[PDB]
Design a protein around this ligand. Structure first.
Ligand SMILES: [Mg+2]
Ligand SMILES: [Zn+2]
Ligand SMILES: [Zn+2]
Ligand SMILES: [Zn+2]
Lengths: 156, 148, 59, 173, 63, 229, 101, 753
RNA sequence: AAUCGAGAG
DNA sequence: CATACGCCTCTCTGCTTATCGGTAG
DNA sequence: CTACCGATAAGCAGATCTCTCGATTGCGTATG
């Protein structure tokens, strides 16, 4: 009898949380890096056939790259937003860039300033949604190609 | 002092599923009282006529039982609601009656309306005009200008 | 702070504001704490006792 | 990838997620593949009638239903087809349609397929034994009512898997 | 070729030749309606097949 | 511990493969007794496993070359050892006086491997073991250069040792393609026994034979018993 | 400004009203299908887990899913399903209106 | 995701579009000036590709947002390239529209009557009217006649749309389906074919020059013909600049705005925005944030991002052409070195070619020229290893384990053997309540080592606390102060969550790749075992998973929300999938040794005394574990009374059924057969058929045919009569029965057989 | 991080 | 002789496209 | 007569589960 070299100490792996891929914010690949295991296209299709929808959403959104992003309700875009630099005692606010003009160009509180010092008044109408970070990455890669994606939010 | 009926889309806590009126008021209205809200601006004070909408289209009114729509991800439910804000509105150029709390040579430390902070700057009962309004600061406040 | 649990998603307005009369002032003064307390935010709702006396008597 | 959206609507018709309709009934009978295990096993059904009743409780599943119109129209159409006897399909009239087409198979008891009725009557021609034809018929019809694909079942995914997974074990081609 | 005439562009793009189906969707200004299961997975919306074919309410007891 | 095969081919001695025994002569019982071996699994004897059955270790080499920064005449910025800075004594408890570790030290995650006083940062820099497998050191080979010019020490090769005892889930295979993971260490009091008084150390199912059609395994069992007797 | 929001609100409310079924024309299955059963149980479980009010005695229970199953047995679940149709329409069947199995 | 931070808003749709050249300029937080990405001293360089305006970078506060690397989301910027570049995505559409256009009269080289016919057809198809678009061709029946045709066709189309909107066959958004999409694409394809076929322009009569192309970023035209010039004169391989093509297209698109609005809008255009032909030309590029262009340290080696490489190359060519323009003005005043001026003008032309090809490389790697090639944006999301398939359809997931599988016939068939090492690592956030503090305080006390235990405690404000490096008394204080009123007003509806270990209460997902069918991914109630680090699986599931124990391993996903728990427990759990929807045949059942032991225990030759019978029944059943129904084990009369009480194996099966089967329910009166012919048992044997009755076995033998991969068996009928749950419990009970039996009377094979 | 090589079901 | 900066060949479907003539203005 | 077109064999674009390890990474020439 031969004792083979496929021992169970070199095959088991478990992750609760840990490192994530920087550009997708999804679990890393591999065992020695303490990554995740891929639920692939075929597994997803199997999960659809059962009709277990929340299982599919948990194994493809909730526990992989669920992010509480911000999207401009007026603009309809995800990655054009930005936090406003606070003044003394102020509270930082989420505000749009595409839907905002310079307060300098147009001739109280609806004026926000970015870090460089410019003063804006404009698209202060951004909400928070629940999207995968791969959505933001895809949006960036499409915008770099000259394509815009308007996202319609249910409450407007 | 004006009344502004507004429609808001406020989330509901599962803990208040047996008292939705209080679950909306104590969760979205009290955090708005005495605060500069970007729809009126003055010290919000009063939440009269809070009416919870119903997600049932064929819902005759006056009913004491209402539907709340549940988000597919979390137990918290969302809905539309209607309520008259009933809020003050001081702005630029309005007569304001105030009092002086502590006199300072550089920035007078005074609480207008017996409760609301303010200050008097350098280059600037009594019915004084208003130049601007300070709401990005710690509290609701307004500086004093005495040019006429 | 100011997450979903303490912030309306949107406060879109339906109509223009309307004012009130003097007989709507002394109603709110005498019938608010009767309808509210007859918590921790109470440190920020005490100023109504100051607002009531402004329109009622001497601060 | 293409069938991954098609799913039974709450009208018992199957239609892709864009709304377009592919079929009005799954296979023409709305019979669930898992649940059709012993629909035609009438001998076993008769042998077990008394055990099957405790789950197909009529008195617990009769009130919130209509038990008359579907069976009446079923007998009407059954007699119609019997009377027309045998004639080529391009000659036969279409004055009477399958019952499930007009009557909801899940709200109207007795609204069942046509092969099911023919085989049920053929095996009820035994005339061998309590248990009577009326109770046996009512229980078989409640079995058919509980043997229907639920709406929203991922029928397209299920069919794609059923036609692909057996292909692993594979003069005209 | 057999899925060209489908309203869900995300299905085609995820399937294959993502570029060509992307051009055909941006040029016609097609508004992906987010109802095919693949589009839902792309955006992160609960799938409508099965336990997503309905909604859930909550009968409150008080006005 | 390896053993010569009783059922050996004639070419086991022409090629001289006695130098590398790859296994052992195990008492196999073709029996359906436990239920823990039906599809392809197999069962080892817990007592036999505890008497050294199929034990083995693993050896891992980890180069600790410290020339990761210096480059062709750039000054030696790091020297193995301990400087005149702050370093907790728990490091020395595991570390030798020169900064390299001892030999035969039990190492886990987070334990120092080798320390050195970094010149620029003015602080000793440790290195940690990267594996969730507790280990024992085997050697520490210092490395120089073959050029006539002499340098400092910057490369060391460490070999590690870990006890790879055969636990349930490990794959043992006959010489007839009858592979199968060990499914339970069956205690000898629960093992079947014979009149002679031996519990077989390996239990395999009979149902593996009909579909697989290996009469070679049966005849090897026969020949092995005959040869040992 | 304010009135355009009223126009949006009226349009959405009228469309919602026209989509629905007036509590008596609904002709869908009375049987609770497995998917509705599973999601009803899960949503009630989540609500209980976030400390939503419970009406039946726990019977020394710790699992919110078990408690929700007990509620479904007692049928004291304040929860309404809403079956959407191909074009889109509602049927707000409540808890004590469907027959299980 | 977290369950105590719900999101009020939600996406409801998404519509593609062209990113207008001026919105990015309004959007952009910084231009990109110089190619040099980084200087020395490890610092960013203003106007580079790592500006602080494009996002935080290695503890450099973002000059746009002001947050740090953990909170800056990135900020897009733009690079302004001087000469407009063809957008490589829409090159074929640009060619189609540029071709078949008459720059002379600035119209399509096609009859305006036919062009208006196609436009009216398309505006009808936008609302789903398919038959109307075909009956529009019934008006055919010169300027006055053509204008009459236009007026009548447009009036007819407006009336048709009015009728459709009034009746209800459409809404304001339009009616778009698969059939309408097919019709629209068919009509557009035929329209493009008809457009790119004509000769001289039919609206004026003038010929126009042809165009050509050597692929992408390669634009050329031609010269006229010896007879064509004569035709043109009586009617009245040159390179083409990108700006020239843009200027040609602008005019014709302004002229044909109607047809172009009905072509470039499959939905009725509510925004009534124009169709500007500059959309085909990228005047300004967008640079993704530093967040999406970060580098990584593979030890000491640091790799510059390939996107930064290609963008810096594009910017190098941009600075080349810009600084070459500075010296082109030097020869502007001195218009006497025109030959060298033409030399540097050819240099400017080649720089135009280079910059267009650089942007082509930056978008599509293959649309570059030159023979390792750097991936482009199209190549980054194109194929199996792209973005859609590798990161949106299927993603790596948290709270999911994996290990080799091993058999365990001592777990219920709806269970799985969870090793202790997973049970101390996989977790589940249980929000503390008054019905959980008994066990959640205990989990907190035990901490992250002693199962059952906890790893983190998530505070009411959403903050997290780790129990990994704490003492017993510290965790005792935390547990005793676990559930407490929250004095924070904002989080007045939230409670602590304990990241407790996976107990036996929960359910898990199991998946053995490849997942050929849906049954290969079910749900199992977890049972925690203090044995080796491997998953332990019952034997019946080997058929469903197609799984063996020759070294197989299968993923074990842990659902993290009650929605998924209830999903896997009711729709996907292994008991609710006794049969497969492929053909409605059974897929579960004991496999080999239980079957071969059944052929022996249910053999007619096997009798068992009182002690052996009772031992078998109790070991199989164990009423203390819920396998019974009468709160006390029941028995059977022995077959034989003298000389001493013996039983039979068939009686053993009968009482096993009687003990598992619910009471006050007739037993399965079953008639079937098995895989064993009568002549094998000898003359007069009737063992080929099994005769069940009232819950008793009376003839034949149990076999594979009655449990396993065979239909119409005893377990199949138990399924058909008591649902799948009782059939699952029968599978489990027979698994524990034929196992304890086969220990006593073992089964073997040898040379004698 | 890709490429190449060894393997597992 | 170290250090530093860029130039270079054994599948199948389904749509790019045919050369020429039929045949009414 | 010839343009409109309706149909005749060839060039190219894009196809053909999950996992764990280890090793290595193109060169030429110019200034000090
Ligand atoms: Mg295997
Ligand atoms: Zn905006
Ligand atoms: Zn920033
Ligand atoms: Zn022209």
């Amino acid at each position: 009898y031969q004792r083979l070299r496929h021992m169970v100490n070199d095959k088991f792996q478990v992750r609760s949380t840990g490192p994530v891929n920087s550009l997708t914010m999804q679990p890393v690949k591999g065992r020695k890096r303490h990554g995740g295991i891929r639920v692939g296209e075929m597994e997803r299709d199997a999960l659809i056939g059962h009709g277990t929808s929340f299982l599919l959403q948990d194994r493809l959104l909730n526990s992989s790259d669920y992010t509480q992003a911000s999207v401009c309700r007026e603009c309809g875009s995800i990655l054009t937003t930005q936090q406003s630099v606070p003044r003394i005692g102020s509270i930082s606010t989420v505000c749009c860039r595409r839907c905002s003009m310079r307060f300098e160009d147009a001739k109280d509180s609806q004026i926000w300033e970015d870090g460089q010092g410019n003063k804006f008044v404009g698209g202060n109408e951004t909400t928070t949604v629940a999207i995968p970070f791969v959505l933001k990455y895809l949006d960036s890669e499409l915008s770099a190609m000259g394509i815009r994606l308007r996202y319609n939010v249910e409450p407007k | 002092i004006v009344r502004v009926p507004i429609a808001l889309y406020v989330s509901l806590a599962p803990m208040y599923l047996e008292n939705p009126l209080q679950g909306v008021m104590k969760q979205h209205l009290n955090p708005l009282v005495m605060k500069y809200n970007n729809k009126v601006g003055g010290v919000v004070l009063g939440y009269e006529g809070l009416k919870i909408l119903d997600a049932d289209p064929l819902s005759k009114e006056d009913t004491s039982e209402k539907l709340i729509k549940i988000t597919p991800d979390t137990p918290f439910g969302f809905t539309w609601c209607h309520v008259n804000l009933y809020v003050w509105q001081p702005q630029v150029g309005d007569v304001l009656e105030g009092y002086i709390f502590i006199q300072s040579a550089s920035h007078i430390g005074l609480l207008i309306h017996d409760a609301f902070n303010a200050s008097i700057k350098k280059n600037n009962k009594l019915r004084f005009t208003v130049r601007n309004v300070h709401t990005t600061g710690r509290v609701v406040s307004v500086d004093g200008t005495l040019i006429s | 702070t100011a997450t979903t649990l303490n912030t309306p998603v949107v406060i879109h307005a339906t109509q223009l504001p309307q004012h009130v009369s003097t007989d709507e002032v002394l109603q709110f003064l005498e019938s608010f704490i009767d309808e509210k307390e007859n918590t921790n935010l109470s440190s920020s709702i005490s100023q109504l006792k100051r607002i009531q006396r402004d329109f009622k008597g001497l601060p | 990838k293409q069938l991954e959206g098609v799913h039974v609507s709450y009208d018992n018709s199957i239609r892709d997620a864009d709304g377009t309709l592919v079929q009005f009934m799954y296979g023409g009978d709305a019979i669930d593949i898992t649940k059709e295990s012993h629909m035609t096993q009438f001998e076993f059904c008769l042998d077990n009638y008394y055990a099957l009743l405790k789950k197909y409780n009529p008195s617990a599943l009769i009130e919130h239903l209509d038990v008359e119109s579907a069976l009446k129209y079923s007998k009407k159409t059954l007699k119609y087809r019997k009377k027309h006897s045998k004639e080529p399909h391009y000659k036969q009239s279409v004055k009477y349609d399958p019952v499930l087409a007009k009557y909801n198979p899940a709200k109207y008891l007795g609204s069942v397929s046509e092969n099911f009725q023919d085989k049920l009557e053929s095996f009820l021609d035994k005339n061998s034994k309590g248990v009577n034809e009326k109770k046996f018929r009512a229980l078989m019809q409640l079995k058919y009512m509980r043997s229907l694909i639920n709406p929203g079942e991922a029928v397209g995914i299920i069919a794609s898997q059923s036609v692909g997974e057996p292909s692993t074990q594979m003069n005209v081609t | 070729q057999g899925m060209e005439t489908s309203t869900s562009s995300f299905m085609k793009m995820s399937y294959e030749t993502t570029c060509q189906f992307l051009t055909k969707a941006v040029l016609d200004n097609e508004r992906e309606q987010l109802d095919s299961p693949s589009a839902r997975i792309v955006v992160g919306k609960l799938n409508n097949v099965g336990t997503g074919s309905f909604d859930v309410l909550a009968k409150v007891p008080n006005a | 511990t390896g053993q010569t095969p009783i059922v050996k081919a004639n070419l086991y001695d022409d090629y001289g493969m006695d130098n590398f025994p790859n296994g052992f002569n195990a008492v196999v019982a073709v029996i359906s007794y436990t239920g823990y071996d039906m599809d392809d699994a197999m069962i080892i004897n817990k007592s036999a496993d505890e008497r050294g059955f199929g034990y083995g270790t693993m050896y891992k080499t980890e180069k600790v070359d410290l020339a990761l920064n210096r480059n062709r005449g750039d000054p030696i910025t790091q020297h193995f050892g301990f400087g005149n800075d702050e370093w907790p004594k728990e490091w020395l408890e595991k570390l030798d006086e020169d900064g390299l570790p001892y030999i035969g030290t039990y190492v886990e995650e987070g334990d120092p491997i080798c320390a050195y006083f970094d010149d620029t940062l003015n602080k000793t820099k440790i290195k940690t073991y990267h594996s969730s497998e507790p280990a024992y050191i085997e050697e520490v080979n210092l490395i120089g250069d073959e050029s006539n010019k002499f340098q400092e020490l910057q490369t060391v090769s460490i070999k590690y040792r870990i006890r790879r005892t055969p636990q349930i889930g490990d794959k043992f295979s006959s010489r007839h393609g009858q592979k199968g993971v060990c499914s339970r260490k069956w205690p000898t009091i629960d093992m079947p026994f014979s009149e002679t008084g031996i519990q077989p150390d390996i239990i395999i199912n009979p149902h593996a034979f009909p579909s697989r059609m290996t009469i070679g395994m049966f005849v090897e069992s026969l020949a092995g018993k005959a040869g040992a007797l | 400004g304010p009135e355009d929001f009223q126009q949006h609100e009226q349009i959405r409310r009228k469309t919602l009203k026209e989509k629905a079924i007036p509590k008596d024309q609904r002709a869908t299955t009375p049987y609770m299908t497995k998917y509705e059963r599973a999601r009803i149980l899960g949503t009630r479980a989540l609500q209980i887990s976030m400390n939503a009010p419970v009406f039946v005695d726990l019977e020394g229970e710790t699992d919110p899913l078990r408690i929700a199953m007990k509620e479904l047995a007692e049928k004291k679940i304040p929860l309404v399903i809403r079956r959407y149709l191909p074009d889109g329409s509602f049927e707000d069947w409540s808890v004590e209106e469907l027959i299980v199995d | 995701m977290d369950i105590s931070k719900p999101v009020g808003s939600e996406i409801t749709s998404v519509d593609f579009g062209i990113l207008t050249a001026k919105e990015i300029r309004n959007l952009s937080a910084k231009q990109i000036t110089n190619p040099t990405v980084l200087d020395n001293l490890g610092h960013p360089v203003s106007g580079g590709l790592y500006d602080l305006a494009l996002g935080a970078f290695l503890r450099n506060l973002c000059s746009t947002c002001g947050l740090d690397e953990k909170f800056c989301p990135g900020h897009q910027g733009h690079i302004e390239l001087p000469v407009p570049c063809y957008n490589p995505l829409f090159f074929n559409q640009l060619y189609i529209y540029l071709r078949a256009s008459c720059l002379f009269c600035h119209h399509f080289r096609l009859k305006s009557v036919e062009v208006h016919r196609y436009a009216c057809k398309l505006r009808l198809l936008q609302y789903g009217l398919i038959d109307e678009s075909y009956k529009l061709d019934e008006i055919t029946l010169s300027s006055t006649l053509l204008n009459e045709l236009k007026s009548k066709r447009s009036e007819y189309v407006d009336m048709a749309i009015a009728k459709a909107l009034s009746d209800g066959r459409t809404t304001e958004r339009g009616s778009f389906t698969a059939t309408v999409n097919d019709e629209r694409k068919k009509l557009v394809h035929e329209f493009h074919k008809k457009l790119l076929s004509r000769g001289k322009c039919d609206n004026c009569g003038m010929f126009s020059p042809k165009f050509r192309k050597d692929g992408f970023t390669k634009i050329f035209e031609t010269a006229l013909n010896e007879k064509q010039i004569t035709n043109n004169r009586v009617k009245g391989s040159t390179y083409i600049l990108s700006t020239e093509v843009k200027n040609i297209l602008d005019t014709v698109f302004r002229k044909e705005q109607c047809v172009l609005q009905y072509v470039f809008h499959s939905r009725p255009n509510l925004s009534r925005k124009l169709v500007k032909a500059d959309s085909f030309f990228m005047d300004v590029l967008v640079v993704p944030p530093t967040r999406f262009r970060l580098p990584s340290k593979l030890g000491e080696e640091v790799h510059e991002n390939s996107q930064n490489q290609l963008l810096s190359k594009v910017l190098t060519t941009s600075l080349l052409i810009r600084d070459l323009n500075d010296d082109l003005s030097k020869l502007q005043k001195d218009k006497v070195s025109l030959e060298d001026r033409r030399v540097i003008f050819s240099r400017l032309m080649n720089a135009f070619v280079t910059i267009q090809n650089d942007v082509n490389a930056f978008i599509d790697s293959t649309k570059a020229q030159g023979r390792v090639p750097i991936p482009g944006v199209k190549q980054a999301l194109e194929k199996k290893e792209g973005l859609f398939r590798k990161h949106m359809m299927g993603k790596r997931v948290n709270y999911a384990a994996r290990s080799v599988i091993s058999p365990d016939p001592n777990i219920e068939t709806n269970e799985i053997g969870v090793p202790p090492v997973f049970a101390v690592k996989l977790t589940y956030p249980e929000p503390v309540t008054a019905y959980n503090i008994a066990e959640l305080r205990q989990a907190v006390i035990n901490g992250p080592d002693k199962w059952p235990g906890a790893t983190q405690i998530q505070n009411e404000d959403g903050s997290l606390v780790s129990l990994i490096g704490m003492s017993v008394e510290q965790r005792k204080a935390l547990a005793n102060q676990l559930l407490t009123p929250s004095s924070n007003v904002s989080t007045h509806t939230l409670n602590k969550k304990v990241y407790r270990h996976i107990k036996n209460r929960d359910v898990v997902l199991m998946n053995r790749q490849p997942t050929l069918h849906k049954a290969s991914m079910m749900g199992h109630k977890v049972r925690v075992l203090p044995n080796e680090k491997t998953l332990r699986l019952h034997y019946a599931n080997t058929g469903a998973y197609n799984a063996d124990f020759d070294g197989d391993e299968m993923n074990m996903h842990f659902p993290q929300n009650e929605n998924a728990r209830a999903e896997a427990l009711n729709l996907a759990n292994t008991d609710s999938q006794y049969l497969t929807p492929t053909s409605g045949s059974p897929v579960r059942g004991l496999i080999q040794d239980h079957i071969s032991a059944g052929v022996w225990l249910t053999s007619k030759d096997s009798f068992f005394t009182r002690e052996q019978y009772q031992q078998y029944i109790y070991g199989c059943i164990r009423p203390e574990d819920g396998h019974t129904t009468r709160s006390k084990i029941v028995t059977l009369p022995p077959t034989i009374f003298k000389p001493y009480p013996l039983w039979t194996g068939k009686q053993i099966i009968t009482t096993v059924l009687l003990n598992v089967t619910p009471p006050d329910m007739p037993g399965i009166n079953l008639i079937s057969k098995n895989k064993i012919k009568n002549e094998y048992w000898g003359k007069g044997s009737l063992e080929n058929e099994v005769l069940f009755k009232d819950g008793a076995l009376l003839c034949g033998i149990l076999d594979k045919s009655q449990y396993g991969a065979s239909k119409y068996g005893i377990v199949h009928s138990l399924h058909e009569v008591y649902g799948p749950e009782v059939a699952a419990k029968v599978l489990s009970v027979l698994g524990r029965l034929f196992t304890n039996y086969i220990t006593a009377t073992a089964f073997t094979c040898g040379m004698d057989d």
